[PDB]
Amino acid sequence: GATAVSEWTEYKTADGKTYYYNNRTLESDWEKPQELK
């Protein structure tokens, strides 16, 4: 999230993987959501 980010908070694992956590349903998914893609 260098510029664009909505209600999600992405987190990164050391091996170079982001996972976007949606604060609406507490749902964490690696794949960029339609609201952010």
CA distances from 2 to 5, 25, 34 (A): 8, 23, 17
Measure the CA–CA gap between 24 and 17, rounded to whole angstroms.
22
Structural domain count of the chain: 1
> What technique determined this structure?
NMR
Enumerate residues 6+ apart whose C-beta is below 8 A from 3: none
Q: Is residue 3 within 8 Å of residue 35, measured between CB atoms?
A: no
> 34: domain range?
1-37
What's at 31, amino acid-wise?
A: E
Which CATH number fits the domain that encloses residue 4? 2.20.70
